[model samples]
Target: AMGIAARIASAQLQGLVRSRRQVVAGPLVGLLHDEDVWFLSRAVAAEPGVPFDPAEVPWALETIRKAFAAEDRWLSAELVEEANPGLAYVLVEHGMTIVSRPPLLAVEPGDLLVPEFPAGVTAAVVASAEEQEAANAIAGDAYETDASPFQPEPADGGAVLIRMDGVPVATAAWTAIADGVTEVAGVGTLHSHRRQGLGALATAYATQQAFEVGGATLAWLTPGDDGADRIYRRLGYEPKATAVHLGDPGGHLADLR
Candidate 1:
């Protein structure tokens, strides 16, 4: 059931949120509820640069903080889709980094093969502590962080995984903010077995699960890298929005005048 353009676009908009990054600043992405727009980024500077509007940005940051503060987090990126026209570089020093710049590939949800995987691989909802830890490990190596949600809870709609021999090698999560809006979160694969279809397996699994749960008409995710974007595209995930990683470079900070 994965060949629709809108669904593909939704998956393209979900952003993998880092806990440490959220605690330090706020959410990794921002969306406008009334406008159907989202701004996905890795890190947010507590204090952003010029031309930033606080009204729109502060709420996004707070929304993230509230999610982490509470155990129950929705896993559909498109849920938060809206025209938040003011998300800019917040704070970059506190592990806030926006990886996807003008996210290359974009697609519809039905464009991917979800609820299915390569031979010998298995998929399931995270129902135990062990699975949660496994999911955290996948995030650790992928996003370069040592943090995850307190425990893997039965989210409103998301999925976890276990490869052959009962080995949990990959995982993904999401946050469905509203109707026609779902955000794909924590799409990660173990380093030792990355390029072996494990990541795609987990992603496809979760994307389908979200669709089944009556989660809006779209699903989205922000790829961590250009190559990641390509993989999502091949799997039917598409790009929607773009922003900076929230940092300064080449003396953009230091002025020795």
Candidate 2:
């Protein structure tokens, strides 16, 4: 099924993108050349001879950083190449850093879950404008200063969030990049609300949404650090693969033991 294939391929993609920047920017790479894009993973492959252009790269970069940049944090496209070498050289020629390494953590879907959301945090379409902004802020702070790649509405292929005290405090998104496959991402919680199980709750909600949206029995995502890996495991998500890679290690790579 298309969903199964997408889920499997997305697992590989999770290992292919190490950070949220790559997660957001990865899909946009196709926009660098094509117009009628079908899926994010095959976007570039869909058009190999698409002439390399620098000016256009900014749009892809900006889209990935929309949420984070809106909140004042660093989201550089310099390392776009490093994260995805297929187009890294082109981005590098533009003064972008080409670390040229894939992402870490590949996981497949499962049925296990942990309840961590509002006794009232029900599933609903995340409205754009102020609600989306509030949700992005909470997720960015809880997960990373950067949010994942998503537009203003779920019609663009995404999910909703859960709020607390009239503010969005958690978020999750799953993209049906291909048939039978839904790439789940954007799981986060407020920094002040960490360790209280919000992330797990949000993940469960998103998984069910993915299944409900015609996805096959499979789903996938790239868990965060070790802590996240643990939480995912507890929730029935399994590690399909592990990739040890980083772009801006700041010499941490050379220092690796």
**TM-score of each candidate?**
0.53, 0.50
Name the candidate that leads on TM-score: 1
Model 2 deviation from native, Cα RMSD in Å: 10.3
Predicted candidate 2 versus true structure: per-residue lDDT over 131-181, tens digit per residue: 556556655533321123446433234666765665556677666444455
In candidate 1, what are the lDDT values of residues 24-45, reduced to their tens digit? 3233343223211122222233
Report residue 159 deviation for candidate 2 (angstroms). 2.4
Highest-lDDT candidate: 1
Count of steric clashes across candidates, in order: 59, 14
Query: CA lDDT, every prediction?
Result: 0.47, 0.45
Q: The CA-based lDDT of model 1 is what?
A: 0.47
For model 2, the stretches where C-alpha displacement exceeds 4 angstroms are 1-7, 10-123, 141-156, 214-216, 225-230, 243-257
